[PDB]
């Protein structure tokens, strides 16, 4: 229960899972805490310790603003931090099977949260089930978010940008140098993440310094080519300066400003982080990944178009109702407490919320493409139309476009369409299969019969858990034993994908073909 690592020994704890044992190492540091002079800087390597580090509780979560739109509501508060917020926050967790495996495949989770929020200690990121059921090692890390993680003065090493991405990268190399001591195989490492974590995974495929740190990639409801995923260098410096003025650190040496921001307290930075965005939407990434010339050597849409990425297998997918989650955070006429039937005027007001800096012609083209009804008389026409708009534009169509262009360079790609609505889902039914609510099924939470899931959900999570693990281990996300539907590869031509539900798992073709031709081919012009 004590493992010797390259920086010192760590003590774990035993866990009882499904009549078996999993050994958990919660809260292993992987960098010098980025405090004082080290704020906004790339993570510094960690120096030796001679103690026995007790890794028996989740460590701090990094500083972040917290969702307060629904106090006391589990649907929003399950995503909020469940440990103390602190700049001292670069730690990681390890779940290994008991008894110690000999050469186990490693799954590295990268959480999402719009690059502004998130923590690895969330209940739905508990990797003890995957270690128990599939005999893999699960690793997750905290990375810096918000301004503290992605504030950028491009070229300036006091604030170069992409610090959170380098946090992730340093965790990946920790697994490279250390996971063998835990019985893991550093040569079979599979990254997987959701939303902003899925966008991080896709950027690790593009950044050269990470190509040796992992084997395969899984992308859940996100990719770097999504419109929220990358901050342009214009936007990047404009928001850094807005933050500088908003806290009285405005100056003209550019290191000037960083040293002044370095002595403000974290809560002041977090307070003014919220307002640096000129055209703010619920999907706005206040401080995100930039083209920094270090992690990102070029504009990532160019690298993807010209095949400049790690050649390997990918598993990509999306949920049925990606967009609904965001409609009750700003769209008029929407509420989680009624059926949110909205009118045409409310739909048009919703597009101005989600596309504030867009042409009036652009907004009409959105309404033109999405308001051709099979039924002029269905009252929920506009309600669902706005949800599909936000989902197709921000998540579904960028993920499909990333998969085609990645597969065009010869690698096996697998695409899924998750359409099961959790039986325990706390949000209303009109929101459907929401953004982020496949995560629990991936992590095997319905396998716990103690916790209120239907038996069909147990079998569905059990099959997903096998497909994900077979993808990590073997690069082929099949369930080979129980007469399952064979998951075909995604090709540029036929574009086959697998649907995941409790009823019938089916092969289908060309997901959202018409909608995505609008968003990917035409809309980038307006």
Ligand X SMILES: CCCCN[C@@H](Cc1c[nH]c2ccccc12)C(=O)NCC[C@H]1CC[C@H](N(C)C)CC1
Ligand Y SMILES: *[C@@H]1O[C@H](CO[C@@H]2O[C@@H](C)[C@@H](O)[C@@H](O)[C@@H]2O)[C@@H](O[C@@H]2O[C@H](CO)[C@@H](O)[C@H](O)[C@H]2NC(C)=O)[C@H](O)[C@H]1NC(C)=O
Ligand Z SMILES: *[C@@H]1O[C@H](CO)[C@@H](O)[C@H](O)[C@H]1NC(C)=O
Ligand U SMILES: *[C@@H]1O[C@H](CO[C@@H]2O[C@@H](C)[C@@H](O)[C@@H](O)[C@@H]2O)[C@@H](O)[C@H](O)[C@H]1NC(C)=O
Please indicate if the annotation marks 75 as binding a ligand: no
Of 86, 176, 284, 411, which one interacts with ligand X (CB under 6 A)?
Answer: 284
CA distance 209 to 206: 9
Of 25, 30, 40, 79, which one interacts with ligand X (CB under 6 A)?
Answer: 79
Please indicate if the annotation marks 114 as binding a ligand: yes
Catalytic residue among 61, 140, 195, 200: 195
Beta strands in 231-368 (DSSP E): 314-319
- In the list ligand Z, ligand U, ligand Y, none, the entry touching 54 (Cβ below 5 to 8 angstroms by class) is ligand U
- Please report how close the Cβ of residue 4 comes to ligand U at its closest, in angstroms: 16
The three-point CA angle 33-138-20 to 5° equals 125
The answer to the question of residue 470 lying near ligand Z (CB under 6 A) is no
Of 5, 21, 32, 56, which one interacts with ligand U (CB under 6 A)?
Answer: 56
Q: Which residues from 238-297 bind ligand Y, rule CB under 6 A? A: 238, 241-242, 278
Total residues at the site for ligand Y (CB under 6 A)?
A: 12
Residue 2: burial class (beta carbons within 10 Å; 0-12, 13-18, 19+): exposed
- Please report how close the Cβ of residue 236 comes to ligand Y at its closest, in angstroms: 11
The answer to the question of residue 317 lying near ligand Y (CB under 6 A) is no
Q: For ligand X, what does the binding mask look like between residues 184 and 223, x meaning CB under 6 A?
A: -----------x----------------------------
- In the list ligand Y, ligand U, ligand X, none, the entry touching 113 (Cβ below 5 to 8 angstroms by class) is ligand X
DSSP-assigned beta bridge partners for residue 321: 434
Backbone angles phi, psi at 16, to 5 degrees: -100, 115
CA distance 306 to 27: 40
Measured CA distances, 484 to 70, 344, 460, 462, 463 (Å): 40, 44, 11, 12, 9
Catalytic residue among 322, 384, 440, 479: 322
The answer to the question of residue 461 lying near ligand Z (CB under 6 A) is no
Over the range 405-416, which residues count as b (16 or more CB within 10 Å of their CB) and which as e?
bbbeeebbbbbb
CA distance 94 to 139: 5
Q: Which residue has the tokens 């997903």?
A: 464
Any idea of the CA torsion for 192, 193, 198, 202, to the nearest 10 degrees?
-30
Can you say how many angstroms the Cα of residue 444 is from the centroid of all Cα atoms in its chain?
18
Part in contact with ligand X (CB under 6 A); list of ranges 277-285, 301-309, 366-374, 511-519: 277-285
Q: CA nearest 454: which of 419, 483, 485, 425? A: 425
Measured CA distances, 195 to 113, 237, 276 (Å): 7, 24, 22
Cβ proximity to ligand U: between 23 and 105 the closer is 23
Of 335, 359, 423, 486, which one interacts with ligand Y (CB under 6 A)?
Answer: 335
Of 232, 338, 454, 521, which one interacts with ligand Y (CB under 6 A)?
Answer: 338
3-state secondary structure of 496: strand
What letter does residue 227 receive in the DSSP assignment? T
Catalytic residue among 204, 369, 420, 435: 435
CA distance 221 to 394: 9
CB 38 within 8 A of CB 110: no
The answer to the question of residue 253 lying near ligand Z (CB under 6 A) is yes
The answer to the question of residue 8 lying near ligand U (CB under 6 A) is no
**195 an active-site residue?**
yes
CA distance 349 to 241: 30
The answer to the question of residue 16 lying near ligand Y (CB under 6 A) is no
CB 67 within 8 A of CB 120: no
Radius of gyration, alpha carbons of the chain: 22
Contacts of 3 (CB under 8 A, 6+ apart): 9, 10, 12, 25, 181, 182
The answer to the question of residue 332 lying near ligand X (CB under 6 A) is no
Please indicate if the annotation marks 113 as binding a ligand: yes
CA distance 333 to 297: 43
Tokens coding 166: 């380098």
Cβ proximity to ligand Y: between 138 and 243 the closer is 243
CB 136 within 8 A of CB 473: yes
Q: For ligand Z, what does the binding mask look like between residues 152 and 191, x meaning CB under 6 A?
A: ---------------------------------x-xx---
**322 an active-site residue?**
yes
Of 45, 54, 454, 486, which one interacts with ligand U (CB under 6 A)?
Answer: 54
The answer to the question of residue 350 lying near ligand Y (CB under 6 A) is no
- Please report how close the Cβ of residue 56 comes to ligand U at its closest, in angstroms: 5
- In the list ligand Z, ligand Y, ligand X, none, the entry touching 277 (Cβ below 5 to 8 angstroms by class) is ligand X
Please indicate if the annotation marks 184 as binding a ligand: no
Cβ proximity to ligand U: between 7 and 515 the closer is 7
- In the list ligand Y, ligand Z, ligand U, none, the entry touching 188 (Cβ below 5 to 8 angstroms by class) is ligand Z
Cβ proximity to ligand Z: between 47 and 253 the closer is 253
Q: For ligand Z, what does the binding mask look like between residues 85 and 104, x meaning CB under 6 A?
A: -----------------xx-
The answer to the question of residue 435 lying near ligand X (CB under 6 A) is yes
3-state secondary structure of 399: helix
- Residue 232: which H helix or E strand, with range? none
Part in contact with ligand Z (CB under 6 A); list of ranges 9-17, 202-210, 232-240, 476-484: 476-484
Q: Which stretches of the chain bind ligand Y, using CB under 6 A?
A: 238, 241-242, 278, 332-333, 335, 337-341
Q: Which residues are catalytic?
A: 195, 322, 435
Residues tagged in the binding site annotation for substrate? 113-114
Q: Which stretches of the chain bind ligand Z, using CB under 6 A?
A: 102-103, 185, 187-188, 253, 255, 462-463, 466, 479, 481-482
């Amino acid at each position: 229960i004590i493992i010797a690592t390259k920086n010192g020994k760590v003590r774990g704890m035993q866990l009882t899972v499904f009549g078996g044992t999993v050994t958990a190492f919660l809260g292993i540091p992987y960098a010098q805490p980025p405090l004082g002079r080290l704020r906004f800087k790339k993570p510094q390597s960690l120096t030796k310790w001679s103690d026995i580090w007790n890794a028996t509780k989740y460590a701090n979560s990094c500083c972040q603003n917290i969702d307060q739109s629904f106090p006391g509501f589990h649907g929003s508060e399950m995503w909020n931090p469940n440990t103390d917020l602190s700049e001292d926050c670069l730690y990681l967790n390890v779940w290994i099977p008991a008894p110690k495996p000999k050469n186990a495949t490693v799954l590295i989770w990268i959480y999402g949260g719009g690059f502004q929020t998130g923590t690895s200690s969330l209940h739905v990121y508990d990797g003890k089930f995957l270690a128990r059921v599939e005999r893999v090692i699960v690793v997750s890390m905290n990375y810096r978010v918000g301004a503290l993680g992605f504030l950028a003065l491009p070229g300036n090493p006091e604030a170069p940008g992409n610090m959170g991405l380098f946090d992730q990268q340093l965790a990946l190399q920790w697994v490279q140098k250390n996971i063998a001591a835990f019985g893991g195989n550093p040569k079979s490492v599979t990254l997987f993440g959701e939303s902003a974590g899925a966008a991080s995974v896709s950027l690790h495929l593009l950044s050269p310094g990470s190509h040796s740190l992992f084997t395969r990639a899984i992308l859940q409801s996100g990719s770097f080519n999504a419109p929220w995923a990358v901050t342009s260098l214009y936007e990047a410096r404009n928001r850094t300066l807005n933050l500088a003025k908003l806290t009285g650190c405005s100056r003209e040496n550019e290191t000037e400003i960083i040293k002044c921001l370095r002595n403000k307290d974290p809560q002041e930075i977090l307070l003014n982080e919220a307002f640096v965005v000129p055209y703010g939407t619920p999907l706005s990434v206040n401080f995100g990944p930039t083209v920094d010339g270090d992690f990102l050597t070029d504009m990532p849409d160019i690298l993807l178009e010209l095949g400049q990425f790690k050649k390997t297998q990918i598993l990509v997918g999306v949920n049925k109702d990606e967009g609904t989650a965001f409609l009750v955070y700003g769209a008029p006429g929407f509420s989680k407490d009624n059926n949110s039937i909205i009118t045409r005027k409310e739909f048009q007001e919703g597009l101005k919320i989600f596309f504030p800096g867009v042409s009036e012609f652009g907004k009409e083209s959105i309404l033109f493409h999405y308001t051709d009804w099979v039924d002029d008389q269905r009252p929920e026409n506009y309600r669902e139309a706005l949800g599909d708009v936000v989902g197709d534009y921000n998540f579904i169509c960028p993920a499909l476009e990333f998969t085609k262009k990645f597969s065009e360079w010869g690698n096996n790609a697998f695409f899924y369409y998750f359409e099961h609505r959790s039986s325990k889902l706390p949000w209303p039914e009109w929101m459907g299969v929401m953004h982020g609510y496949e995560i629990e099924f991936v992590f095997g939470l319905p396998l716990e019969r103690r916790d209120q899931y239907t038996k069909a959900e147990e079998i569905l999570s059990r099959s997903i858990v096998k497909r994900w693990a077979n993808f990590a281990k073997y690069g082929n996300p099949q369930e080979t034993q129980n007469q399952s539907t064979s998951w075909p590869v995604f090709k540029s031509t036929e574009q086959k994908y697998l649907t995941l539900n409790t009823e019938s798992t089916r092969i289908m073709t060309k997901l959202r073909a018409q909608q995505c031709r609008f968003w990917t081919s035409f809309f980038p012009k307006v």
